[PDB]
Amino acid sequence: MQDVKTYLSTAPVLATLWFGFLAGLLIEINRFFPDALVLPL
Amino acid sequence: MFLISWRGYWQELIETLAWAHERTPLANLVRWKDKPVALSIVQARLVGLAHFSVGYIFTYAAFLIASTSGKFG
Amino acid sequence: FNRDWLRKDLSVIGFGLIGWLAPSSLPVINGNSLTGLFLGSIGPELAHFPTGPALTSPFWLWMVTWHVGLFIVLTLGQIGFKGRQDGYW
Amino acid sequence: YIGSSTNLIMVASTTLMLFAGRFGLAPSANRKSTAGLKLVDRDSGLQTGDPAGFTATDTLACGALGHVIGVGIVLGLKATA
Amino acid sequence: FASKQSLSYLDGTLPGDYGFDPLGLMDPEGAGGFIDPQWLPYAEIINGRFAMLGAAGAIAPEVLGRIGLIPQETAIPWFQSGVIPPVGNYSYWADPYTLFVLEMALMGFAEHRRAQDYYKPGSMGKQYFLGLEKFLGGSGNPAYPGGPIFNFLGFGKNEKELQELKVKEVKNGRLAMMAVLGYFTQAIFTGVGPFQNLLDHLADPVHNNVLTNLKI
Amino acid sequence: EVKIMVEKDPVKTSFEKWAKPGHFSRTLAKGPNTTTWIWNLHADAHDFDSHTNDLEEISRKVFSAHFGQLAVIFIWLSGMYFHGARFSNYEAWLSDPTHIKPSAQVVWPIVGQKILNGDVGGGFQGIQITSGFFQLWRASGITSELQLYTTAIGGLIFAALMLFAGWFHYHKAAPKLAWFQNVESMLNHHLAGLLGLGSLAWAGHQVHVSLPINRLLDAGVDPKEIPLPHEFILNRDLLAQLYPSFSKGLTPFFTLNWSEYSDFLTFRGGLNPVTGGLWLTDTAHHHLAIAVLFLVAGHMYRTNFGIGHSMKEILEAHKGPFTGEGHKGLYEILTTSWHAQLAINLAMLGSLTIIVAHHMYAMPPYPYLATDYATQLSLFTHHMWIGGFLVVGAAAHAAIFMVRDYDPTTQYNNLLDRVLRHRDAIISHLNWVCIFLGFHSFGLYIHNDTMSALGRPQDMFSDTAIQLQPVFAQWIQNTHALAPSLTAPNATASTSLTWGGGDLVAVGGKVALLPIPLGTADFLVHHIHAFTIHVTVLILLKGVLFARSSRLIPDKANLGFRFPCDGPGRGGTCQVSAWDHVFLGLFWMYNAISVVIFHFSWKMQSDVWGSISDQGVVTHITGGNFAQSSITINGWLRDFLWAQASQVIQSYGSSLSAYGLLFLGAHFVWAFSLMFLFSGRGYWQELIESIVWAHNKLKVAPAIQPRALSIVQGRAVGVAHYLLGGIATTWAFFLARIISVG
Amino acid sequence: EKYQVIEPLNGDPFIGGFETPVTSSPLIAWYLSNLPAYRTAVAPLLRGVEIGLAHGYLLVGPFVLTGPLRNSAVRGEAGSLAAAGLVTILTMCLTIYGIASFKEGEPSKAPSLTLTGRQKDADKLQTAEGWASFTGGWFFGGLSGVAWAYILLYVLNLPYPVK
Numbered sequence A: 001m002q003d004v005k006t007y008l009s010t011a012p013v014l015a016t017l018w019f020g021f022l023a024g025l026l027i028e029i030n031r032f033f034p035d036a037l038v039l040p041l
Numbered sequence B: 001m002f003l004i005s006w007r008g009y010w011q012e013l014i015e016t017l018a019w020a021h022e023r024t025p026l027a028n029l030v031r032w033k034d035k036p037v038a039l040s041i042v043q044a045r046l047v048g049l050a051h052f053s054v055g056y057i058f059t060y061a062a063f064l065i066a067s068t069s070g071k072f073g
Numbered sequence C: 001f002n003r004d005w006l007r008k009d010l011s012v013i014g015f016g017l018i019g020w021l022a023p024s025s026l027p028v029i030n031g032n033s034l035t036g037l038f039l040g041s042i043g044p045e046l047a048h049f050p051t052g053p054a055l056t057s058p059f060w061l062w063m064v065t066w067h068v069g070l071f072i073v074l075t076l077g078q079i080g081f082k083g084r085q086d087g088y089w
Numbered sequence D: 001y002i003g004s005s006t007n008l009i010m011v012a013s014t015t016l017m018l019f020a021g022r023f024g025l026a027p028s029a030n031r032k033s034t035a036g037l038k039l040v041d042r043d044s045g046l047q048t049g050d051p052a053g054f055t056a057t058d059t060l061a062c063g064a065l066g067h068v069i070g071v072g073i074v075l076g077l078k079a080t081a
Numbered sequence E: 001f002a003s004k005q006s007l008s009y010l011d012g013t014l015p016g017d018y019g020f021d022p023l024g025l026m027d028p029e030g031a032g033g034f035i036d037p038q039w040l041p042y043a044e045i046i047n048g049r050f051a052m053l054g055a056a057g058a059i060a061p062e063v064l065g066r067i068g069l070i071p072q073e074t075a076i077p078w079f080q081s082g083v084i085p086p087v088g089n090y091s092y093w094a095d096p097y098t099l100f101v102l103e104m105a106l107m108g109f110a111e112h113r114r115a116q117d118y119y120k121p122g123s124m125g126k127q128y129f130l131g132l133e134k135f136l137g138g139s140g141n142p143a144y145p146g147g148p149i150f151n152f153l154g155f156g157k158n159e160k161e162l163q164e165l166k167v168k169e170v171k172n173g174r175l176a177m178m179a180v181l182g183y184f185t186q187a188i189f190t191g192v193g194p195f196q197n198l199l200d201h202l203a204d205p206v207h208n209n210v211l212t213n214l215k216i
Numbered sequence F: 001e002v003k004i005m006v007e008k009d010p011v012k013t014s015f016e017k018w019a020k021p022g023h024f025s026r027t028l029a030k031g032p033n034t035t036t037w038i039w040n041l042h043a044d045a046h047d048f049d050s051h052t053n054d055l056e057e058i059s060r061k062v063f064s065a066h067f068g069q070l071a072v073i074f075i076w077l078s079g080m081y082f083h084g085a086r087f088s089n090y091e092a093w094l095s096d097p098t099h100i101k102p103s104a105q106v107v108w109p110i111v112g113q114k115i116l117n118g119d120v121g122g123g124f125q126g127i128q129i130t131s132g133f134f135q136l137w138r139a140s141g142i143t144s145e146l147q148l149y150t151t152a153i154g155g156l157i158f159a160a161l162m163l164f165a166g167w168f169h170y171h172k173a174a175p176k177l178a179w180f181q182n183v184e185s186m187l188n189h190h191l192a193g194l195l196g197l198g199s200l201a202w203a204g205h206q207v208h209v210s211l212p213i214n215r216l217l218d219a220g221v222d223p224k225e226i227p228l229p230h231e232f233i234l235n236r237d238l239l240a241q242l243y244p245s246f247s248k249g250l251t252p253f254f255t256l257n258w259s260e261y262s263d264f265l266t267f268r269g270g271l272n273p274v275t276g277g278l279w280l281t282d283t284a285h286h287h288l289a290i291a292v293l294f295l296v297a298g299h300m301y302r303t304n305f306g307i308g309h310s311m312k313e314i315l316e317a318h319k320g321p322f323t324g325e326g327h328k329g330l331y332e333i334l335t336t337s338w339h340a341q342l343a344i345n346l347a348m349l350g351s352l353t354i355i356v357a358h359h360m361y362a363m364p365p366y367p368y369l370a371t372d373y374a375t376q377l378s379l380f381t382h383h384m385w386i387g388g389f390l391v392v393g394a395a396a397h398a399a400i401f402m403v404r405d406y407d408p409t410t411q412y413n414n415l416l417d418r419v420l421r422h423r424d425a426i427i428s429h430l431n432w433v434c435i436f437l438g439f440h441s442f443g444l445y446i447h448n449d450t451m452s453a454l455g456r457p458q459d460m461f462s463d464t465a466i467q468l469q470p471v472f473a474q475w476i477q478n479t480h481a482l483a484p485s486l487t488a489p490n491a492t493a494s495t496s497l498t499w500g501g502g503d504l505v506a507v508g509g510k511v512a513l514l515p516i517p518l519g520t521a522d523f524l525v526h527h528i529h530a531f532t533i534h535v536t537v538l539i540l541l542k543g544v545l546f547a548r549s550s551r552l553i554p555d556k557a558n559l560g561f562r563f564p565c566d567g568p569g570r571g572g573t574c575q576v577s578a579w580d581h582v583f584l585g586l587f588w589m590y591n592a593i594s595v596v597i598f599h600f601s602w603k604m605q606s607d608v609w610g611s612i613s614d615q616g617v618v619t620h621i622t623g624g625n626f627a628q629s630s631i632t633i634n635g636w637l638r639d640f641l642w643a644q645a646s647q648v649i650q651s652y653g654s655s656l657s658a659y660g661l662l663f664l665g666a667h668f669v670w671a672f673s674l675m676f677l678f679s680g681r682g683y684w685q686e687l688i689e690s691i692v693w694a695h696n697k698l699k700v701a702p703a704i705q706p707r708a709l710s711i712v713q714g715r716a717v718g719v720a721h722y723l724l725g726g727i728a729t730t731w732a733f734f735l736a737r738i739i740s741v742g
Numbered sequence G: 001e002k003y004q005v006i007e008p009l010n011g012d013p014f015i016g017g018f019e020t021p022v023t024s025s026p027l028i029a030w031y032l033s034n035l036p037a038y039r040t041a042v043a044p045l046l047r048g049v050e051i052g053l054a055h056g057y058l059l060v061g062p063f064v065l066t067g068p069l070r071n072s073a074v075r076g077e078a079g080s081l082a083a084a085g086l087v088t089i090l091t092m093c094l095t096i097y098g099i100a101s102f103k104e105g106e107p108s109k110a111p112s113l114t115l116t117g118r119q120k121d122a123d124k125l126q127t128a129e130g131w132a133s134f135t136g137g138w139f140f141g142g143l144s145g146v147a148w149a150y151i152l153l154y155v156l157n158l159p160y161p162v163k
């Protein structure tokens, strides 16, 4: 299990997880707050 | 063609061509004075850039002149 | 270089001619009959060469088949000799 | 159908192929043909009760070739005649 | 002693050994996976015993119906009982899929236990089963467990009678395997039960064979 | 001799090596020092023969990796079937094939993506697809989504099975080297089973399922009312109602009365008038005949049972007085090196794929495929590109074999040595052929351009001016058109409608196929094709033949297969390796295939495809301008690229906007590749030095030292981005134009 | 099975080239040896005369049948003039080549050894005076051949299949 954790810490896997989470967050934000051109605050 | 393909390919091809010329009847009667070789690396870059620039200039000059003279407006 | 590189037999010609004319002549109105007829049916040959046959003619197919068969038979006959005496089997 | 021409052709083809197999008139498992078609002897580790060396592999091969030749002959004769 | 060459590894110690191996499947030179020489005899015995059961049970109901022991509502052929609903179906106390689940549960217990005894010979008689682990320790050869359940009458007390019984088992098993294959093929070609096929071949042997049934 | 030989538990299953990124290589395992290590790791991953020296491990790795690729393909097929079962209008299309556009991809509403969901018909919104899966499913007899869902589940199960098989045969029971070298047994088993039995099984499926269902569909029966496929097996009365010869059973088969089955095993040419596709009864007789032929062919080679041919003796027998030892020594090469087998198989597979493209446009095998112009264009272009890539790979891996696995001891006076001994003559004569073809074809085009510009159209090489007719192709067309009367009398019609003889097939007011005239322009364009193909062959063959040595570099085989140069000496030795020859052959293959697909698109749109109205008058998409406008380069530029790109550049704001976006993006990527192609490594290394100083000034320099891409990597990146850009540009252009006007 | 046709050039494996049916063959060798170019003992002027005659005669057809004036009433004259101009340009090329290649003192460059090892006098064509004489002969012969072809084609009728 230690070897699995070491493999999951490699650069491509971590990059995939991080960019997937970031893309999901941005997609959900644009789903709930669409067509945002200027910052209201 | 000069920009992408480099020298060794052309040098070997010219070697085969020289072998062919030296072994052809009625053509051995004619001999070159200078041994044919491929262009130099820097010379190849320069010739590629020259063909490139001439094509660029001529193409845009033709387009500009024609597209402005067909209408004159 | 051997002067007679193509080791001269010159009797393979007759054997090839016979062994190609025997099969081709067999079928009804098929084989060398067509080539012979078109050799005869030149056209207005009273003086010289009547203009060549058009695309829409069977002469081309018949001549192609006949000469292809003749050349195949001749080559296999030449290999049959000169290959039996050199070994190879 | 038993006395029909097709049955006779098929049985004759199969029988002739088997006959040419068992007796040295055709290649088989224990009798290899060379480049000159000479039928030299070949030793295979197959045991058979036939004293001439005819095995079950040869039986299957000769029967298959006989069925093939018989079918071809029957169809050709039907198409021509 | 019969069939093909003596392959130099089928010496004859196995029951039913006649040196029949044209494809050399049991050659111990490269013998990994399921082609191990210690797995093939066991697998032959297992498909053989299941084939004996299958042949007897696929021919029994129709014969019993012809004699009259069982109601004619249950004298249906083997393929009209629920194995193939598109061909025929019978209504039991449960739908066939619940029956399949229950059957898979019971056979899963039995078969995973038998597998664990094959792979770990001494096991299945150590951990606490519901009191029956005492009789479930297979002695020696995995294919012949024995004991107070699997051999509860005491046959083959001496070695020679046991050899004869093993040989008899192998032959009846091979015969039943071929019989089951025949059941399948004859069901496909004729569309009736194997017993009806037997009666048809008996009534008119020359006009009721495989050559006649080429048209279905 | 031939037997199963395996080893038990060779490699233990663990995750330890998953944490050692470069374990397979003895130099990469030590870890990285520069950024070159990452590229070397991802570049040497699947190059098994460079890691070890024993053929056994290489063979086992190849077997398991091929299992993995099979599993990936099964996942892909399952995905296609599922996405067609749940996100498609396949049933509505089944009802009305000629008006409903196929669609199997649906996009989510997120950022305005809604506009891509087009109005394809059938109360459905989605992306129109051009893969031709609807036609294939209809030809298979599928009439519901339940069958597609079942097929998807089966595909997933098969993917799992392939994954397990790969794991089993690498980590648990690995075959020995003697198992892989049974080439006679491998050919027997594959040629008989995989081909003949597969074809026989498909013929059985066609006869027992597809013929009745498609017969009912063509008659006019509503898809919902057609009985299910098993009802034609359980009840032969229906199948005898459709094809009466089924009422006889299998008696005609065994009594050799094969003429009784002539109502569903036919030999008729042409296309079905209703659907514009090949008759399925012909497809039945032909998959059956293929099955028989392959099953007979697979019983040829010698094995444990004595009978059969031996390939070594056959190869050693055929030799003559012109070739010395002949084909001797090839058996050991082909049973010892994986790369030679890969080269041969890649060449054959690429050529076969090109043949598939040609035969598939000329004789459309699926119903309602000929009148779906987008599908025809897409399939032709796709499989043509695939074939080109494979034929380039053949030369690449043949050169790899020549550099690595060649052994002069075994090859003394056989064909390989004698080919390597007269290579200068080969390359010289092929150079002359390339120059001759280029001049006497492209100079003809330039001559036409100059005559047209000078106002002398009577001096051109056109149909109205000086003519160049393709008499040989015209004769072949006429001969093939008259076959059903003389040389293939049992045929009803000719093989295809493209031959000169024949008529017009129209399905739903659109032309399916039509006789294709050949004139001066066709002469010019096939001789262009010949020029480009001989040039690509010249490049690749020069790369393969001079891979080990030349006059310039006598010891090229010591430097390896993939090296940048041998220094600026001898005048300069850039790109002397076989890898760079493949690198240039890729560009020339791109050129050739682009010209081929442009020829196909213009000729089809100009002379075959079109709309037909009452009284049988045909109007073509571009109105037959190929014959006059394709004889000049200006004609191509104006009447093909400028005229036909109006659809892709005006697709903004519609459902086709993605095609315009990818058109622009592909022009961009193609331009982007030129910066890798035209430049060198030293400039970028020095610029990286300056940038590294900048990062060092703020204590943020990386531990792994940044390095400029290697020379070979620069060339590879350039060619990859170049090919992607060009092919994607053509993809977007074709799809937009043909979806708009098709 | 030991009989082979292909042989190294003159039996030397280490000289670049092979000796094939195309290269060495009694018919091909006789034909190539009897061409004027390889008649090393004949005066270069007469060899040039024959070569020029043949080339000038063959050149007339392509220029007349294809050309700007091929459909006019002066097609033959225009084609003949074009062929004569090409002959003049090639004569200029021969002259400048001979000037650039040979000097007045060099003995000769042609090989003086036959294949069978015999020693013979080297060809006088590969000399300044020899090349000059050959060039003059080629010019005169080319003009004569062009004139002869023009006369045959148009001065006299002489019907031809294509003409």
Ligand SMILES: CCCCCCCCCCCCCCCC(=O)OC[C@H](COP(=O)(O)OC[C@@H](O)CO)OC(=O)CCCCCCCCCCCCCCC
Pocket: A001, A004, F013, F014, F015
């Ligand atoms: C479902 C399809 C299959 C998926 C993968 C299945 C893997 C099964 C085990 C493979 C290794 C077999 C050999 C064991 C032995 C082995 O690998 O090396 C042996 C090694 C021993 O380590 P120890 O520290 O226990 O012992 C060291 C000795 O020196 C003294 O005891 O590690 C293990 O035992 C770990 C075994 C599990 C390692 C993987 C754990 C995680 C697996 C699953 C990851 C995904 C989880 C997803 C959850 C949703």
Ligand SMILES: CC(/C=C/C=C(C)/C=C/[C@@]12O[C@]1(C)C[C@@H](O)CC2(C)C)=C\C=C\C=C(C)\C=C\C=C(C)\C=C\[C@@]12O[C@]1(C)C[C@@H](O)CC2(C)C
Pocket: E020, E021, E022, E023, E024, E025, E047, E048, E050, E051, E053, E054, E055, E056, E057, E058, E077, E078, E079, E081, E083, E176, E177, E178, E180, E181
């Ligand atoms: C298990 C089996 C049958 C089981 C049947 C069962 C349970 C039936 C159950 C039911 O019917 C009932 C009772 C009642 C029904 O209502 C329901 C069902 C459920 C339907 C058959 C095996 C059957 C197994 C068979 C037929 C095996 C054949 C093998 C052969 C011929 C091998 C030959 C060779 O392997 C050798 C020996 C040596 C090699 O070298 C060469 C070759 C030639 C390869």
Ligand SMILES: CC1=C(/C=C/C(C)=C/C=C/C(C)=C/C=C/C=C(C)/C=C/C=C(C)/C=C/C2=C(C)CCCC2(C)C)C(C)(C)CCC1
Pocket: D014, D059, D060, D061, D063, D064, D067, D068, D071, F292
């Ligand atoms: C024992 C014995 C014997 C013998 C006997 C006998 C009688 C035998 C026979 C045998 C036989 C008689 C065999 C046979 C076989 C056959 C076969 C084996 C066949 C097969 C077939 C096939 C394979 C076909 C196929 C096909 C084709 C090709 C065509 C189409 C269709 C099909 C696909 C089906 C002896 C004398 C020794 C002694 C005494 C006793």
